[PDB]
Amino acid sequence: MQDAITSVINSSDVQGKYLDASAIQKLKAYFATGELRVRAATTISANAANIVKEAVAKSLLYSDVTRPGGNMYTTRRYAACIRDLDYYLRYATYAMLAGDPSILDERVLNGLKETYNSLGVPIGATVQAIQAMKEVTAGLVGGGAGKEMGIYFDYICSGLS
Amino acid sequence: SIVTKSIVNADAEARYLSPGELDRIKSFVTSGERRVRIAETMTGARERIIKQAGDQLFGKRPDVVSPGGNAYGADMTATCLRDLDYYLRLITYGIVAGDVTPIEEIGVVGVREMYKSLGTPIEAIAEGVRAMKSVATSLLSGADAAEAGSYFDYLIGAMS
Ligand SMILES: *[C@H](C)[C@H]1/C(=C/c2[nH]c(/C=C3N=C(/C=C4\NC(=O)C(CC)=C4C)C(C)=C\3CCC(=O)O)c(CCC(=O)O)c2C)NC(=O)[C@@H]1C
Numbered sequence A: 001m002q003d004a005i006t007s008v009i010n011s012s013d014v015q016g017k018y019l020d021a022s023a024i025q026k027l028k029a030y031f032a033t034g035e036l037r038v039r040a041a042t043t044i045s046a047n048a049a050n051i052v053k054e055a056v057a058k059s060l061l062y063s064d065v066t067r068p069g070g071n072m073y074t075t076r077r078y079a080a081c082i083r084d085l086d087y088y089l090r091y092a093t094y095a096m097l098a099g100d101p102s103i104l105d106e107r108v109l110n111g112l113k114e115t116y117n118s119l120g121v122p123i124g125a126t127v128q129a130i131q132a133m134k135e136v137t138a139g140l141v142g143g144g145a146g147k148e149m150g151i152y153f154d155y156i157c158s159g160l161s
Numbered sequence B: 001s002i003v004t005k006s007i008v009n010a011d012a013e014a015r016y017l018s019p020g021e022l023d024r025i026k027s028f029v030t031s032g033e034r035r036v037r038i039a040e041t042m043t044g045a046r047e048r049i050i051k052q053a054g055d056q057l058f059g060k061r062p063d064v065v066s067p068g069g070n071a072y073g074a075d076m077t078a079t080c081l082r083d084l085d086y087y088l089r090l091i092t093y094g095i096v097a098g099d100v101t102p103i104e105e106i107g108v109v110g111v112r113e114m115y116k117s118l119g120t121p122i123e124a125i126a127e128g129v130r131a132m133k134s135v136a137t138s139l140l141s142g143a144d145a146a147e148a149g150s151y152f153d154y155l156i157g158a159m160s
């Protein structure tokens, strides 16, 4: 994975160039928001469980998905599902901390859609649950961090389409 | 950087970063401007740093520039200085990242196999890095000199 710093280093390196003024502006921009990112990561971390619980309550509970025949039926599948949501939240936080979505492409999205399709995991419902976590999260980290987190929540959703 | 490393570590343990890890990123970002400043000073003096380090190198190791030496000839000497420039560049990358990984991943892995194939005495390359370390840190303040010096030392140790 690349973070916002190493991302700038790599593009400079491919051109064989020392850090530019433009490259330096990007570095400084990430440094300025560093504390914001750490404070959001801290809250999310402390509310991870409640964030997932509320998102599920709001998007999956009491529907055909949880009833016999639904993909969330049986305690094993219910847990597998909340396990995935815990994943999306933890990885979205990583990407927000790094200021780069590469960890998502490499460790999350690679082969995910195919796997879901293979198992019959509904992508539309999964996407709705992530969008619900998006909203629950904004409300904890505030509008600022909330929109940043939203970029990465959407990135994942886009990769499932 | 330490952001990537902390993330990779926390992920290996399927957990969120620890407060300790978070504090590390915290310091990392506040010292960002200092490090960027250090890197800028080195970038600006790039040409002068390579000329003087080059001169000091050929002074300590005339052989490489003499007949039968790997850098004998305007052109081979030029290419030798070109390599020194590649490394100064990597070092400024290292400084802004806060660690050696960029130096390591772009110019250290496989460095012994590459130079052995070209017949370049790697001990002389290290000497050239020692020279640059000297010219470069001389441009900095006591505090920054020590800080940037550590990146040079890493590289020197990886070639020895
Ligand atoms: C919950 C919102 C939805 C749901 C999910 C559900 N998923 C699975 C199974 C798997 N989920 C993954 C996803 C990941 N695995 C990882 O390691 C990571 C981290 C990058 C991710 C994002 C995988 C690989 C599987 C298969 C392997 C496994 O089970 O560990 C299930 C179980 C499927 C089954 O039939 O057993 C479920 C139910 N299901 C829903 O209905 C919601 C829409």
Ligand SMILES: *[C@H](C)[C@H]1/C(=C/c2[nH]c(/C=C3N=C(/C=C4\NC(=O)C(CC)=C4C)C(C)=C\3CCC(=O)O)c(CCC(=O)O)c2C)NC(=O)[C@@H]1C
Pocket: B057, B064, B069, B070, B071, B076, B077, B079, B080, B081, B083, B084, B086, B087, B106, B107, B118, B120, B121, B124, B125, B128
């Ligand atoms: C200078 C201190 C020493 C010296 C150097 C020297 N190097 C070459 C040739 C090459 N050096 C490289 C170097 C790198 N490639 C990388 O990707 C990196 C990391 C960023 C480095 C440092 C390469 C690729 C070459 C091959 C030529 C090319 O660039 O295509 C030469 C030429 C040798 C020859 O036989 O042609 C020389 C002279 N030689 C010394 O004696 C000094 C100790």
